Amino acid sequence: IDGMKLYLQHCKTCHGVDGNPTDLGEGLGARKFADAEWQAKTSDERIIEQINEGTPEMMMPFKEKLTPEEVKALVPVVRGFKK
Ligand code: HEC
Ligand SMILES: [Zn+2]
Ligand SMILES: [Zn+2]
Ligand SMILES: [Zn+2]
Ligand SMILES: [Zn+2]
Ligand SMILES: [Zn+2]
Ligand SMILES: [Zn+2]
Ligand SMILES: [Zn+2]
Ligand SMILES: [Zn+2]
Ligand SMILES: [Zn+2]
Ligand SMILES: [Zn+2]
């Protein structure tokens, strides 16, 4: 399973190639991933829950689109943006 390939296919349109949100993502409410303070207060389970369930009117749920293994493979991608 390629995490980065999944991210570019499903996430980059809102969150950006570097974790800095696009025009679409920012307008919907997304903040940058390369944020030390965000990374520090955010658990892996919070990242997994967000991918799975989304946020109403902000981010679609991905639980019917990706297996738990695919969701888990995205954690290091999100973590790898920092600074
Ligand atoms: C545009 C429709 C989006 C797509 C496609 C994806 N995400 Fe997203 N995400 C979006 C918004 C507007 C927000 C803010 C809403 C909120 O409740 O925080 C988010 C949030 C995240 C978060 C952070 C949650 C937190 O606790 O701070 C993560 C980790 C995240 N999103 C990851 C993510 C991944 C891995 C995606 C592809 C499968 C993805 N998102 C798609 C907008 C959009
Ligand atoms: Zn896919
Ligand atoms: Zn998709
Ligand atoms: Zn900060
Ligand atoms: Zn971890
Ligand atoms: Zn929760
Ligand atoms: Zn939950
Ligand atoms: Zn959520
Ligand atoms: Zn939220
Ligand atoms: Zn809606
Ligand atoms: Zn809706």
Residue numbers in the entry: 33 to 115
The publication says:
Anaerobic ammonium oxidation (anammox) is a bacterial process in which ammonium and nitrite are combined into dinitrogen gas and water, yielding energy for the cell. As anammox bacteria express a large number of small c-type cytochromes, these have been proposed to perform the shuttling of electrons between the various parts of the metabolic machinery. Kustc0562 and Kustc0563 share 37% sequence identity after cleavage of the signal sequence and display a typical type-I cytochrome c fold.
Indeed, Kustc0563 was the first protein from an anammox organism to be purified from biomass and also the first to be heterologously expressed and characterized. Similar results were obtained when Kustc0563 was treated with imidazole, but this protein could be crystallized without it. The simulations predict a preferential interaction surface between Kustc0563 and KsHAO. The predicted interaction surface on HAO displays a pronounced positive charge, which would complement the equally pronounced negative charge on the predicted interaction surface on Kustc0563. Moreover, in the related Kustc0457/Kustc0458 complex, the typical 24-heme electron transport system of HAO-like Kustc0458 is extended from its heme 1 onward with the hemes of the complex partner Kustc0457.3 Interestingly, however, in our simulations, heme 3, which in KsHAO lies at the surface of the protein at the bottom of the concave surface between the protrusions, is consistently predicted to be part of the interaction surface with Kustc0563. This opens up the possibility that in the interaction between KsHAO and Kustc0563, heme 3 is the outlet for electrons rather than heme 1.
